[PDB]
Amino acid sequence: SLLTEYGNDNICRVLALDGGGAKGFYTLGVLKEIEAMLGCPLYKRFDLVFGTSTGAIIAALIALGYEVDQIHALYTEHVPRVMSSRSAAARTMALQDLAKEVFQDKTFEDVLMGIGIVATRWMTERPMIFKGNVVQAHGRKGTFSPGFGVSIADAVQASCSAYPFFERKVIVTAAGDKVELIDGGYCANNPTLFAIADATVALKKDHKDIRVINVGVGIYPEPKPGLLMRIAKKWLAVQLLQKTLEINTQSMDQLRDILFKDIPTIRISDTFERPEMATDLLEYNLDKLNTLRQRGRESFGAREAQLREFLI
Amino acid sequence: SLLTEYGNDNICRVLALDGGGAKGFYTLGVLKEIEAMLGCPLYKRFDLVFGTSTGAIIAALIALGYEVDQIHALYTEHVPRVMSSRSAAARTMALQDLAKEVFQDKTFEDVLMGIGIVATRWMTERPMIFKGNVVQAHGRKGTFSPGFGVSIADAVQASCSAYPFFERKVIVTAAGDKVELIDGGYCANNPTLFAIADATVALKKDHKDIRVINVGVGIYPEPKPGLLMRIAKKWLAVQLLQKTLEINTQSMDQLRDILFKDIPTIRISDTFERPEMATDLLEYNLDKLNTLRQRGRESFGAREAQLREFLI
Ligand SMILES: Nc1ncnc2c1ncn2[C@@H]1O[C@@H]2COP(=O)(O)O[C@H]3[C@@H](O)[C@H](n4ccc(=O)[nH]c4=O)O[C@@H]3COP(=O)(O)O[C@H]2[C@H]1O
Numbered sequence: 047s048l049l050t051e052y053g054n055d056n057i058c059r060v061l062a063l064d065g066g067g068a069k070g071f072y073t074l075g076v077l078k079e080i081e082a083m084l085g086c087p088l089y090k091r092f093d094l095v096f097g098t099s100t101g102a103i104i105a106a107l108i109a110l111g112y113e114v115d116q117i118h119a120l121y122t123e124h125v126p127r128v129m130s131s132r133s134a135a136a137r138t139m140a141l142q143d144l145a146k147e148v149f150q151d152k153t154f155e156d157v158l159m160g161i162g163i164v165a166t167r168w169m170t171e172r173p174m175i176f177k178g179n180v181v182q183a184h185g186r187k188g189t190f191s192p193g194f195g196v197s198i199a200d201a202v203q204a205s206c207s208a209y210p211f212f213e214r215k216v217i218v219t220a221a222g223d224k225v226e227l228i229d230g231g232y233c234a235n236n237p238t239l240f241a242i243a244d245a246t247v248a249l250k251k252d253h254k255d256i257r258v259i260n261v262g263v264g265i266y267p268e269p270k271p272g273l274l275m276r277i278a279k280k281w282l283a284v285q286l287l288q289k290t291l292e293i294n295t296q297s298m299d300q301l302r303d304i305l306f307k308d309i310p311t312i313r314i315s316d317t318f319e320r321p322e323m324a325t326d327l328l329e330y331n332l333d334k335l336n337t338l339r340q341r342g343r344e345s346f347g348a349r350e351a352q353l354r355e356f357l358i
Numbered sequence: 359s360l361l362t363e364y365g366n367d368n369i370c371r372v373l374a375l376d377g378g379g380a381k382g383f384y385t386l387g388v389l390k391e392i393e394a395m396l397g398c399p400l401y402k403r404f405d406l407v408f409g410t411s412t413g414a415i416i417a418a419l420i421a422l423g424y425e426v427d428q429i430h431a432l433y434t435e436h437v438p439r440v441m442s443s444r445s446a447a448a449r450t451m452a453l454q455d456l457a458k459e460v461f462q463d464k465t466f467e468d469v470l471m472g473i474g475i476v477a478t479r480w481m482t483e484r485p486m487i488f489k490g491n492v493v494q495a496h497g498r499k500g501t502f503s504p505g506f507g508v509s510i511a512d513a514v515q516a517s518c519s520a521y522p523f524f525e526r527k528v529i530v531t532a533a534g535d536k537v538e539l540i541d542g543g544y545c546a547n548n549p550t551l552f553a554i555a556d557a558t559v560a561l562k563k564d565h566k567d568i569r570v571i572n573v574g575v576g577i578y579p580e581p582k583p584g585l586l587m588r589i590a591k592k593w594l595a596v597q598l599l600q601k602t603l604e605i606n607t608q609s610m611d612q613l614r615d616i617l618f619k620d621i622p623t624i625r626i627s628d629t630f631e632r633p634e635m636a637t638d639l640l641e642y643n644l645d646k647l648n649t650l651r652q653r654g655r656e657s658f659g660a661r662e663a664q665l666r667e668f669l670i
């Protein structure tokens with residue numbers, strides 16, 4: 047049904063997807079409406095998609111040409127099960143199962159658009175960004191291999207490996223370098239700035255010719271310690287994890303606005319008074335998470351006129 | 359003794375100081391040597407100083423015209439006592455005592471150079487940066503008040519209030535807005551990028567005419583859970599706090615390098631195999647912390663030739 051076709055212009059259209067546990071049902075609600083407004087799969091209209099943690103799941107599926115409805119079905123099938131886990135080993139196994147089943151043996155040579163999948167290096171404590179094409183590399187292009195030769199499953203699993211509650215994910219690059227990786231949300235749970243870095247620096251696009259759409263997971267009432275103590279034994283570490291991720295997400299958006307006022311950007315992550323959920327790490331109740339789909343469609347509707355102007 | 363005088367050029371010299379508990383003895387070791395190499399108090403040569411958490415203590419004293427030896431004496435007198443606290447209430451009281459005793463009733467109208475003191479808004483989860491002069495504001499300059507009318511004590515206490523282990527610090531701005539603030543290290547424990555944002559965007563300085571010096575606290579062997587379990591009851595939250603702060607520090611440096619390759623910058627935060635310490639929150643043993651002073655002087659000596667070229 048997504049038969050609408052678009053001409054080519056010199057405008058770089060960038061999509062940046064936040065991480066947020068199983069609450070990306072909100073993200074998919076926003077994306078569904080953007081898809082139906084365009085009349086084409088998202089990879090045809092967007093030049094670059096960045097994602098972090100469970101947002102990298104969506105970003106990778108978009109880059110492989112999936113339609114949002116297909117993404118929603120896979121996301122429903124696998125993401126809540128990961129978050130329902132209540133042991134580190136169960137969480138890591140659930141996540142490994144998701145990665146292989148969803149992405150199989152696809153690689154970063156298989157993508158149909160620019161991509162960036164953000165993880166965090168345990169050793170250097172700096173990001174490792176799996177990319178698809180050398181033209182968005184900022185250096186060392188003689189040794190560039192798409193995705194470091196790593197499969198999309200391993201890159202997405204790394205992006206999601208929120209140690210200490212998941213195991214760290216060990217990777218060996220095509221150049222023969224072994225790296226231990228953890229969740230990308232520690233350095234850029236909101237990956238918009240990173241995506242902009244590719245567009246401005248690596249793709250040499252002028253700020254006038256960039257359109258950025260950054261979709262989050264939405265903002266909901268924070269779980270209080272009384273609830274957290276009943277479901278998590280390390281409740282304070284669980285709360286600290288959530289609060290720090292939120293700060294990283296919001297402060298990253300403020301920094302983008304400070305440094306890149308002249309880059310047209312729409313961020314979609316509205317505040318709601320329901321549902322009352324656990325943290326991103328722990329929430330898996332599909333009855334609550336499915337209502338985030340509607341909330342995402344509501345957030346699109348509040349911005350549809352400007353989104354039409356961005357994406358044409 | 360600091361009698362050397364320097365002419366005026368159009369080069370913006372920027373100093374950016376990481377947070378790191380009581381381990382800023384390392385920072386002061388680096389700064390002592392920079393001071394003695396210059397022959398003047400740091401505020402005469404530097405145009406802008408940014409600091410976060412215990413690094414904002416040093417940055418504020420530099421901005422008030424203190425000499426590094428004076429800063430070291432105050433830092434020794436008050437910072438380790440804060441970190442020796444083993445209850446939230448004891449920590450918050452120790453920190454309040456430090457703020458008032460060290461800075462008394464000085465305000466952001468009392469500074470002798472540009473300053474930025476970074477804290478984190480609990481509500482918006484975005485930075486609140488206390489500044490001294492409207493010319494480094496990026497907007498809303500009609501309502502600008504130096505430091506929001508807040509005293510340096512309250513701004514530095516806010517920058518250091520690492521909730522959940524300190525209480526959040528309540529502030530009322532000169533415009534009559536009340537804000538709850540926590541440690542700046544949650545959004546920019548390394549404040550170099552923020553400082554660069556002021557120099558490039560707000561001060562309209564060309565990248566060629568900026569010199570950035572970013573001093574950290576150094577990198578040391580990480581405490582393992584066996585040790586942490588013996589000194590902290592919420593040891594996993596304590597470890598997560600340290601690891602996330604480190605990632606914020608190092609990833610912030612990587613992002614600066616990606617976005618601002620053409621801004622001359624020196625970062626000084628070397629790796630050492632001793633001393634073995636607790637996390638930044640918990641370490642207070644002066645016998646260990648005092649050896650960081652020597653390590654900071656060693657780190658300066660490895661970069662003295664290039665530091666001479668930066669600062670003349
Ligand atoms: N848009 C951005 N926003 C914020 N930070 C960014 C961004 N881009 C890079 N970085 C950081 O800068 C460091 C060096 O980047 P370089 O581009 O200069 O060199 C690249 C490239 O040549 C090659 N390579 C990259 C991707 C791939 O799929 N295959 C592959 O071969 O490896 C190096 C990447 O390694 P890391 O990713 O581990 O480290 C990066 C990252 O920490």
Ligand SMILES: Nc1ncnc2c1ncn2[C@@H]1O[C@@H]2COP(=O)(O)O[C@H]3[C@@H](O)[C@H](n4ccc(=O)[nH]c4=O)O[C@@H]3COP(=O)(O)O[C@H]2[C@H]1O
Binds near residue numbers: 300484495552
């Ligand atoms: N260099 C930077 N790097 C990264 N982020 C930055 C930087 N600078 C600002 N921001 C962020 O951008 C938001 C809006 O900044 P604006 O400069 O546009 O307006 C300012 C100013 O007009 C006025 N004001 C500022 C300081 C002072 O001592 N008295 C005073 O009156 O208040 C607003 C500040 O409030 P916050 O600090 O709470 O929010 C900031 C911050 O989140």
